[PDB]
Write a protein that binds this ligand. Structure first.
Ligand SMILES: Cc1[nH]c(/C=C2\C(=O)N=C3CC=C(C(=O)N[C@H](C)c4ccccc4)C=C32)c(C)c1C(=O)NCCN(C)C
Length: 502
């Protein structure tokens, strides 16, 4: 439901308005041609207007398919790529990969196939595009078109930008609404934080901590920040909407009490990927519990509620007795200095709870006081059942190792050590990260599962506006980019991109 005049709101400015952008946007190849969704498409569209560059984009696409191809189908896919792109007589032959690299990857196919067989070549491809072609694109109309899209992206985000609908629950420091962008019609979840309730509790730094952590991480398995803006009496965080219900609901109301191992495997795998993306920013979630794992319309999960998350200064540890009773790792209960390790304890708690239908330290039918739950977490050894395979028992107690130094994933290798565990022996994480694995459960779309100045300065740092990557993804999902990104007939400069007549 895009506003009747959405084409006027997203109307491209004249290229002459973007001059200040042209000389401030850093010209990084990976940023303008890969990370940024709309730049990526534009550069790919530039290469589509040249004969020599065309085959280089097609080859990268086919290598992407190779990586997610099933194992038994890998030798077949590999041969096709070579006969098509790496044959000297092919019409779309890749040339910058020297003859001493096509004759090399030929041997990898003469042997067993690996999912990274073409990773060597693909890099040689990007090394060529980073050079001449990238600098030609920079002086093409497609980059001028990119500058226009950036100009729109940086437009101020007000309250008429959105359209509030309902209250999707609530929590502390505010409530969560469901909002829609009038111009594109995309649904988000607005996290409205009462302005006067923040100053009173004196928790200003905790509000920026969450906003800054959300905008810096872009993961398929963590709620993504798309906008942040101030308003009268509230500060808002526009986040990914999740209509599939939380994991606590599905463990207890909709599962046995619990799930099958294979089903928990899927959710555990996605949660482990979420945590890995956070850890790449040396950030700890510290708040793993079933009700913070939400499900979307398709059955995939995202971590939510980064309010207790913090960015660890690299090479340093932190202190903080924070979390929920029963989901706090020993180092946290003891108020020790820890790193990322609480998040791998929490992953243990979830795999266990998913499979058994109760916490590993408190029964579903047990009346127990907090202190006894903490004692257990610190001293007692959890017990497993026939619901767990030996592999499942292993990863759970490895992750529930009370000594954070001996705990799985709490080493130099990190999440990779956990993905290698026999528990995920049958989980192809590459196909998972690409969304190609069907979720186990699919929700139904119809279900129901005061005038100071120091405060002014605190708002400017928070109300940064739209987030770059999520905003561009919004333009693409709603097909606003497909509709507005129109050039002139037969490779002609459209009026907006021609400096002769504004
Ligand atoms: C659709 C929907 N969204 C959500 C919720 C979310 C979401 O989607 N994204 C996000 C991202 C981040 C949070 C988050 O920080 N929270 C914490 C606790 C919080 C902290 C401070 C203030 C308020 C809240 C929540 C959400 C819920 C429950 C339903 C829901 O289940 N509503 C009942 C009927 N539904 C089936 C339609």
């Amino acid at each position: 439901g895009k506003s009747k005049k959405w084409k006027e709101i997203l109307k491209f400015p004249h290229i002459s308005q973007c001059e200040d952008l042209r000389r401030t946007i850093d010209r990084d190849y990976c940023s303008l041609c890969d990370k940024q969704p709309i730049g990526r498409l534009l550069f790919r569209q530039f290469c589509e207007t040249r004969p020599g560059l065309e085959c280089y984009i097609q080859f990268l696409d086919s290598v992407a398919e190779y990586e997610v191809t099933p194992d038994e189908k890998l030798g077949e896919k590999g041969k096709e790529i070579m006969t098509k792109y790496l044959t000297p007589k092919s019409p779309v032959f890749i040339a910058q990969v020297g003859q001493d690299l096509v004759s090399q990857t030929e041997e990898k196919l003469l042997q067993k196939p690996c999912k990274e067989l073409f990773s060597a070549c693909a890099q040689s491809v990007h090394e060529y595009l980073r050079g001449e072609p990238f600098h030609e694109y920079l002086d093409s109309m497609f980059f001028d078109r990119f500058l226009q899209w950036k100009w729109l992206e940086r437009q101020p985000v007000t309250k008429n930008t959105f359209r509030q609908y309902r209250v999707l629950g609530k929590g502390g420091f505010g409530e969560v609404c469901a909002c829609q962008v009038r111009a594109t019609g995309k649904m988000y979840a607005c996290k409205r934080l009462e302005k006067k309730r923040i100053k009173k509790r004196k928790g200003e730094s905790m509000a920026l901590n969450e906003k800054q952590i959300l905008e810096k991480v872009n993961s398929q398995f963590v709620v993504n920040l798309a906008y942040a803006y101030e308003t009268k009496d509230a500060l808002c965080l526009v986040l990914t909407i999740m209509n599939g219900g939380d994991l606590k609901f599905h463990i207890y109301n909709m599962g046995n009490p619990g799930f099958e191992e294979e089903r928990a495997l899927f959710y555990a795998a996605e949660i482990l990927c979420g945590l890995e993306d956070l850890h790449r920013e040396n950030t700890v979630y510290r708040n793993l519990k079933p009700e913070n794992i939400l499900l979307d319309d398709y059955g995939h999960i995202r971590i939510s509620d980064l309010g207790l998350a913090v960015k660890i200064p690299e090479g340093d540890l932190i202190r903080g007795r924070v979390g929920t009773v029963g989901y706090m790792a020993p180092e946290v209960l003891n108020n020790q200095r820890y790193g990322l390790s609480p998040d791998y304890w929490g992953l243990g708690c979830l795999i266990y709870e998913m499979i058994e239908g109760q916490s590993p330290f408190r029964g579903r039918k047990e009346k127990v006081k907090r202190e006894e739950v903490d004692r257990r977490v610190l001293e007692t050894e959890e017990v497993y059942s026939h619901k767990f395979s030996e592999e499942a028992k292993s990863i759970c107690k490895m992750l529930l190792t009370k000594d954070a130094k001996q705990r799985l994933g709490c080493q130099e290798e990190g999440a990779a050590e956990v993905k290698r565990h026999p528990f995920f022996r049958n989980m192809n994480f590459k196909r998972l990260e690409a969304g190609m694995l069907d979720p186990p459960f699919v929700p139904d779309p119809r279900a129901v599962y005061n005038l100071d100045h120091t405060d002014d300065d605190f708002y400017s740092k928070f109300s940064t506006g739209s987030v770059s990557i999520p905003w561009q993804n919004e333009m693409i999902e709603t097909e606003c980019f497909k509709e507005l990104n129109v050039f002139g007939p037969n490779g002609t400069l459209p009026p907006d991109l021609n400096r002769n007549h504004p």
